[PDB]
Symmetry: D2
Subunit: 354 residues, 4 copies
């Protein structure tokens, strides 16, 4: 791999509904977004079947739950502008049509919830800068104008809340390094300058919060292995050194915090199967990678069920969505084998960033 | 103090709205519930002023946020039945009237959200058993019939989710010990038998989850000091031994998890001022108690703002509500002095359990 | 129990030799010190048999290993002065006669090794102050004059190194509180003033260092339960609050750090059997007490073998020494039942402090 | 660098005496071992001056403290056999001549103390296997015959005790991977087979024990950065995955456990200055590397003083030994600048393993 590579992305975006049922969003061969969901938040739930949103799209969709429980999806349209749709009532299959947010978008959209309930969307714009737009009232269709945060992006953005409620955004720069920018006051339009975390990355960055309130960032490195970095915390503006983990990965990573508070990461491995690693103690060292049977054709998308069980979604060799999951809430639970969520086939609609 | 004492309770119940503004509920000298709120989730926010719900009540109110962001309050009526009211839209001051849930209630109500979005209410009933009632569909006015969980209660109940989504309820028994009972499958009507945690307690129990997914229970003991106990976790059904902390307390305790992941506890101390203790490291030992200036007339009620700042509410010597808070999100932040939230005076409406 | 009680002490002092064999020292019905040892540092070792030191004594003996591996024992004589004897070669049963260190002693002696290799002995003196005496050259028979550290003692002293090499001494005061005093520079005659840790104690204090370099003190409290306190560390001069653990104990406690870095405490319980508690996680909560079969007649004395296995010594109902131990180095190892180390019977020679 | 490289070694071996004074051993331009020491275990101690052992040698010397406090040095002679010398009394400058242990040695010697007090020496032999020899009685000149442990070595060996008293040896193999072999019972001639930890290394391995009883191994990797691996512990035979830390190093690393229980590592960096990294929390992430002023000409050798202060020794550009140290015991202590321990110049006598 070249320093400017961007590892294969996940094939769906996933959210928990207000009642914690999982719901997935992808793009089919008709270039429309389709979605599917658990019919109940139970370990044996059926899935509803694939349902289409009318309209042709031109990015991977991004979904988030509003602070009033309603899911809302963001996507680039055929006009290269940002569009969104939403549940009109929480937990209900009554959706808006696609509605315009305008702009000129040159990445997949990334959505985050501010600590005051307002959704915020981050994209690369027509000038390769980071641009953003936000709800001006929590869980309302009153959106700001577009505003630039500058920079020069070469990955999709990844956004996450700090423990103190400040959004922080991570994106690869023109030097192939990881850069980041943050709100300097929680849920306010007061932002830092861009700063570099150094290190070349070859995937989009993925971010999660630890127990202790420290963000941790994962990405593939120049040598095609997973690497990670974390905030020092305790009111320091600093970050740790980077660490790599042995094992060549061949997709973006996906991180999750298990219900014991430990981090886990999933990624497609060198043999094209799903790999998993976990922290073996608090803050710990990391386990050797463990493999699940079966060749997969995307990065994993990882979620947690109502009961904490971890569930993983991937593109199969049949171009359909498959999943596996923990059979119990235990961190030592056994896992299922891949099962098909059939009814459509999927395409990787991610925006080709070059 | 006698083994059967129940330490002075908090004077309000508090919730975060969908947009994370704090909102408080208490009972005035007209025996009606009144509420007040931050007008914005900011460190300098004004408060709206006290607003009345019409209707006479006969318990402390309990508030929870639905899974669709709407606040909902539970209280005993003049008929000794359970009543509830709610926001008809998240973040909005449009409330239902008090609506009936019936029953015969002999404690304050305790409300919890299941891991599938459904509210559930626990009370002591006419026979001194634990009784419960629940939404049958998340965030809907479709409620179950009343059902008994048995037992013999001598405190108000305290309910909390386990990390795996099972509700667990704690209440003092006929022997003045702490007892508990739990869902054996997440968000299902499948419950354990009652089991004893031994130890005499002289307050209602207070429960919180740690980072690591272990519940921790706090209560005043027979010697009038704070004591605590925690789940061993890692798939064990066991709990630790009890520990007491030196320092005589004269109210119920209130616990919070700070945005660094450490536990803190607040309680009125032996000198009738607010005391605070914190874990000094991960799982740690606990700090000596620290005092805030000012004689207080209830237990503290503790909450976190949108940005993580901890805020504490108490009854003053003027019979009004006062608060203080961290001025920044830092775990070493300074604190304000008591400030008045004026406009009404409050009574302790808690049900007299004897 | 009265606040001025001092819980029953251990019946032997124990050390590891230079080759890590365990060796025990007690006083028989002839009022002489006798000793016994493992013949090899193995899980199945025989014990050598009891060997007498000639001479009548009037305290419990205290043993320490010199920095050149030789064991050295300290005891009060019939003249109320301090005496000592030593191995003349490490691991060898060639001992000096009892040799005089003079003084006037009114407690058992307590011995510690400074971080520069010099033994130091602490006693209560004729005036009830803490007095001390030390090697002036490591592992040599060149001893200082006696020097007073002042105070007013009502327990035997307990001494331990801080992580930074400063000796710290703990002893109950005239108010029945725990007090302490320390070197302010490592292995130097530069000492603090006495300071109080407050809390009444009803045993001698017992001290151990944690992994993280923080001292932790254990003692029985006024309510006859175990209590503990620890340094906050990270360059703070402070200590935590005290915590008690439920369960009435009827001897002094004995603490050990297991080879996983967690603390364990042993004590005779309310039913006169040996009880054990352990930290269940790092810094953790503490386990419920677990009991071993058999009524015992002293506090436990606890040690670790060459391989980390924990071993416990007690006075039996036959007035002889018994022991039990972990059968493997695992922190989940099984334990033996009491086994007799026969050949003599023992008396409690501890100085009657009143 | 090539996979078969072995990074520049430290220029001295160091030990603490029985009284904890530091003492260093190196080889001068006369091909003899010389030594120097602190005259007192104090922060301002003078050093004694360089003292010669007569006799020409052909490896780096290795020093250890016996279980009776006497230092003992091991070196290869002009006959390619192993020789040793020792203090005849602890803390005293009365040394034996070089005495023969025979053998045929093709690496530097590595010495470890068993958990029963017996020294043990590990070398690569004439057949490239690991060979060993040991005291048969603790701290005595009664040595075993030579015995082979097999394997094929391409680095010097590194030995360390497990928490349970079993010696474990680490060495690079014929595939340039890290391999290891261990006692299966503490301080017994019962050994495992060789097993591979995989990963190519380009230095000798360096091993330390954590607080929690888990060994951790450090080495330079194929990409010239530091990497590390640790035991999972809790009775597992497993190890973690490898992690690398960013930053190119140009010597072997040296690890230390600070008196707060956290690990630190020192190494010459890419700019030929001394670099340091530390764990920022328990088990933590690792800090960015920090540099000390001054170009150095060996790996660092790191030690701790009687009071815990960390001290580092290096070859200077003048071919003499220099050191720097923490001025206080605090983990946030300031550090001195390089100071010269003058009187001789040193050579790197390490055995050329190719």
């Amino acid at each position: 791999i070249e320093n400017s590579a961007i590892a294969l992305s996940g094939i769906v975006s996933v959210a928990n509904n207000a009642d914690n049922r999982l719901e997935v969003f992808g793009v089919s061969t008709d270039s429309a977004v389709w979605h599917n969901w658990q019919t109940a938040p139970l370990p044996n739930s059926s899935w509803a079947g694939w349902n289409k949103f009318n309209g042709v799209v031109t990015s991977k969709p991004a979904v988030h739950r509003n602070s009033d429980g309603r899911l809302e999806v963001f996507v680039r349209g055929t006009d290269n502008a940002l569009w969104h749709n939403w549940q009109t009532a929480a937990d209900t299959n009554t959706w808006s049509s696609w509605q315009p947010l305008y702009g000129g978008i040159t990445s997949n959209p990334e959505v985050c919830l501010n600590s005051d309930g307002r959704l915020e969307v981050f994209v690369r714009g027509s000038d390769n800068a980071l641009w953003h737009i936000w709800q001006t009232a929590a869980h309302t269709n009153s959106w700001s104008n577009w505003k630039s945060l500058g920079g020069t992006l070469t990955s999709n953005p990844a956004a996450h809340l700090n423990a103190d409620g400040r959004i922080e955004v991570f994106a690869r720069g023109a030097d192939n390094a990881l850069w980041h920018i943050w709100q300097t006051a929680a849920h306010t339009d007061q932002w830092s300058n861009w700063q570099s975390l150094k290190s070349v990355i070859t995937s989009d960055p993925v971010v999660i919060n630890n127990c202790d309130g420290r963000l941790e960032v994962f990405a593939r490195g120049a040598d095609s292995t997973l690497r990670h970095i974390s905030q020092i915390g305790s009111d320091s503006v600093s970050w740790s050194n980077w660490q790599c983990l042995d094992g060549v990965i061949t997709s973006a990573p996906a991180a999750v915090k298990n219900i014991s508070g430990q981090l886990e990461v999933f990624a497609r491995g060198a043999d094209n199967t799903l790999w998993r690693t976990w922290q073996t103690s608090h803050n710990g060292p990391w386990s050797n990678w463990s493999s699940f049977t079966g060749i997969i054709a995307s990065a994993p998308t990882v979620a947690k069920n109502s009961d904490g069980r971890i569930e993983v979604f991937v593109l199969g060799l049949d171009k359909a969505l498959w999943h596996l999951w923990q059979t119990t809430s235990s961190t030592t639970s056994s896992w299922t084998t891949w099962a098909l969520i059939g009814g459509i086939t999927l395409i990787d609609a991610s925006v080709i960033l070059e």
